[PDB]
Design a binder for this molecule. Structure first.
Ligand SMILES: COc1ccccc1CC(=O)N1CCC[C@H](C(N)=O)CC1
Ligand SMILES: [Zn+2]
Length: 139
């Protein structure tokens, strides 16, 4: 689990969004595993606007942060799960690192701010949904 709180927005994995997220929906994209909802309180986070390919993510299944080198956001095949049919997930970045299903929502950051959130993984890989292209989160 986990979320990004920026301005009056909450960014979560679409497959983990709550009834309240859907009732206050701003935008969602099943191909990216992202959902953004509106909030009343001002958020705690800043979004990176950069091309970094190194950063640090939080891994809840180890209670630790790990440094990672990750690929540029791209269209990557993701196998069927309880949450989605087999499909290409867009704006996804892969890295070598530990992840388990409950790790979704962990934040990846670089020196500029929040880069994205854990969305996929397995077999020593971890995949992050990028949010750096969502310029409207900043206003
Ligand atoms: C952290 O992810 C993993 C880690 C280890 C093993 C498996 C996973 C992947 C995983 O749990 N899912 C469920 C959530 C949907 C996701 C997606 N974004 O399409 C792909 C499949
Ligand atoms: Zn950066």
């Amino acid at each position: 689990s986990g979320a990004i709180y920026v301005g009056n927005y909450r960014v979560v994995n679409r497959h983990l969004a709550t009834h309240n997220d859907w009732a206050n929906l701003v935008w969602e994209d099943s191909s990216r595993d992202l959902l953004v909802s509106s909030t009343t309180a001002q958020g705690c986070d800043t979004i990176a606007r950069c091309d970094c390919q190194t950063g640090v993510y939080y891994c809840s299944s180890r209670r630790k942060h790990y440094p990672v080198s990750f690929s540029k956001p791209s269209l990557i095949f993701v196998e069927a799960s309880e949450y989605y049919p087999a499909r290409y997930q867009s704006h996804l970045m892969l890295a070598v690192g530990h992840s388990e299903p409950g790790d979704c929502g962990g934040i990846l950051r670089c020196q500029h701010g929040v880069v994205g959130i854990v969305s996929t993984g397995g077999n020593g890989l971890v995949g992050f949904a990028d949010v750096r292209d969502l310029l409207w989160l900043d206003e």
